[PDB]
Design a protein around this ligand. Sequence first.
Ligand SMILES: O=c1ccn([C@@H]2O[C@H](COP(=O)(O)OP(=O)(O)O)[C@@H](O)[C@H]2O)c(=O)[nH]1
Ligand SMILES: O=c1ccn([C@@H]2O[C@H](COP(=O)(O)OP(=O)(O)O)[C@@H](O)[C@H]2O)c(=O)[nH]1
Lengths: 425, 429
Amino acid sequence: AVPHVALLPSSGMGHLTPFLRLAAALASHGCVITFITPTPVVSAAEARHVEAFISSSPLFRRLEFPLLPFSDDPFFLQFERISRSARHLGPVLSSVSPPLSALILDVTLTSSILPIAAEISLPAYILFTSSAGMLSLCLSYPEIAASGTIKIPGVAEDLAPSSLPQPLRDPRNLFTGQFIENGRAMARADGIIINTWEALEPATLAALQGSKAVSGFPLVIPVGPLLAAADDLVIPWLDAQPASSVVFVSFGSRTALSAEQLRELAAGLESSGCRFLWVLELLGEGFLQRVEWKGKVVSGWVDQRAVLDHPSVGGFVSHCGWNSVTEAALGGMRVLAWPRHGDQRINAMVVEKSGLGKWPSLWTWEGDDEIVRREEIAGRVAELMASPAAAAAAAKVKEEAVRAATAGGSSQRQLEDLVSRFTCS
Amino acid sequence: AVPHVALLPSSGMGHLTPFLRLAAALASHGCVITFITPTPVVSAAEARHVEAFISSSPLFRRLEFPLLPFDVSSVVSDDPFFLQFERISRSARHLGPVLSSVSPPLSALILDVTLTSSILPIAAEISLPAYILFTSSAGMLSLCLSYPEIAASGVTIKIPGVAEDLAPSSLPQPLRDPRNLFTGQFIENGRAMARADGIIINTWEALEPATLAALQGSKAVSGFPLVIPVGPLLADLVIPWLDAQPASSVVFVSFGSRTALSAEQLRELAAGLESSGCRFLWVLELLGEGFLQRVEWKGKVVSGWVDQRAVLDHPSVGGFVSHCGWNSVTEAALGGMRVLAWPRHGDQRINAMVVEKSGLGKWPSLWTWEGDDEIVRREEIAGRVAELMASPAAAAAAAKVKEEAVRAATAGGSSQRQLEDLVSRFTCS
Ligand SMILES: O=c1ccn([C@@H]2O[C@H](COP(=O)(O)OP(=O)(O)O)[C@@H](O)[C@H]2O)c(=O)[nH]1
Ligand SMILES: O=c1ccn([C@@H]2O[C@H](COP(=O)(O)OP(=O)(O)O)[C@@H](O)[C@H]2O)c(=O)[nH]1
């Protein structure tokens, strides 16, 4: 028979892409998928992606949940309303037919929905969007806050305080309290699902392997990597460009770069001496006309997977969002790591240890006052684009990543084995 | 009369080498240097090095102050580093008479930072100008100068030149415990350094523009800038083997005078160096049995003291793996050899940031310290070492470092001018 799995995502492309990709893989291994999407949607633009994906096949169905909305922080308001309906969701889950084999929920909503799932005796699995290092920080942070130090079992004997997400720096914070809850809450979950593989984070996972879920099984389940217009002016341009000669710089869904900092990144690319593709009223009037021959910059949404797999692009300047890292790993693009906020610094550490790319540690976060000079920016880009051994190291990540993805690999085995937990007798 | 300067260096080749190089530079610009060397010598080997230096010329001189006998009941904690410091520190009071009696009278006294707390009061009594020579980098200097304020604060380190939020891991491992004699000794020296008439460093504006700019601001010297940068001070089986090797092909790996690398770690550097597949001259018991035979064509590993300056100037070497001792960092900067920064202890982690910011070398932050003991695996050593040699942009960056460092060192350069000005201070009307 065919198991039935409900997916409860959270707002934001960074959380949304993995869920779609995780849903796609579960359908490929026979499961039938029902997305729980609460209404009204935070973002019309993100809603289009879910609609088109669900529209494509009868294996996926959409369930609309009324938000039932009633510090006044802007992002938190959406989550509060998203999390308020937590109690109400319980009856709706039981009503769904055919009976769900299991529920898979976003980390952010882990604290809110885990009791509901436990109330109705529904197995609850958490999808972790981030790296295993970030997960390792999350799981052990409640213990750390009591007696802190900052030794994260997965990747740090003493993590520098800058590497912690910028909100987490002050303990008497609203963010800190929720963070401690999620970490504590995740241990109680039936399973945790991450988009990492053993080759990419052997150290963090091996430490993580010891952690044990309540239900007689390892808490953490790695199924990664998962594989699944504005580009119209881009793809033709890229094809003209020589093989592996174009720097690609993108910060993902949220790119809060200040104008002072912006001018420098722009100056660095011009001073880089290599072609660049940049995605975001020019600050320099003739900058665009002057640089048209060397590189193209587009303000719209683009097609990162096509760009990363494009032959002409040779390097990736990144903010080290976990989804973009995995996509860069698959591409084998050497990555220069400019982590912007949150878990992005820890992700940068993963990039360097893996050999996927190099991280200028002394470079600043969004909170930091100090700007990054263009001359410094130009050096690392030119260096990254000209280092053959860096390219070769990136190609090993790709091979290893594909190996885990390909059939028989450690990751596909874990997804096959996870599915069986649903096909119970 | 020709200016007469008194040098009171602390023990250790890393501290001794700048003094000697500064002494030669000062002598070159018309100075007679008198070395205050205590008896009994800490090290015969260092003492022989100094004696050979004094023999070089009539301008250099040797004067010995016998260390006062220790009081056994008084000694605290039984530590060899501190006991040696304590005997030299204890003779501070005795030192003033000897200084005044010198013939001809000394224009100024220039002393090691470590002994500066003990000796600075002596100088004020005899009205002798005291300058401290700072063996380390400007960034490190910034930490010493502001560490006392930071300690009585804190939420964020924020060393003025080094960073906004310096990581605790980057701080010297002794400093991590605040209630320590070392942490207190560190705090005293920093306070003392403001009082001093001047602070000399082995740096130049080109190398550390931001950190030096901030220091220009402190100007704690009465009526003058406190910081005087005169850097870069400039003054067997291995070479023959080097000459054979092809141009810019050899990885030089050396951790200075003190290189405590654990046995488990030692194996990894060998495997990593072997695996990288590029040539390597490794300076430092058969930890590897067939390792030397397998890599005999590729590299030379020797245990003796070696002419590092010749190595770094050699055309066949292409990359340098170091512990980022300021003396080693500055030597490489003159050579323009790209560096792979593996800081081991003390101020070396701060030095690594200067190597990465300069473009002289790349620093792998995640690499462990002697304090923490998670080893660096050979897979990472091989990749990082090989990539450094493979990377042409890294060579260009180091080449640019050399040019500016040469510029400062040559006539009309920032430092050369600054050294000239300092000699004038010693010779007034
Ligand atoms: O112009 C774009 C911008 C982003 N992406 C996608 O943004 C995804 C994940 O974003 P990430 O986690 O790396 O950054 P975050 O969303 O977390 O700020 C990646 O899968 C990209 O495919 C894209 O396809 N075209
Ligand atoms: O085999 C060696 C090791 C070191 N040095 C010299 O020791 C100097 C300073 O060493 P550094 O301060 O950088 O490290 P430390 O000795 O203080 O740990 C360098 O200038 C080298 O010339 C040398 O000549 N031969």
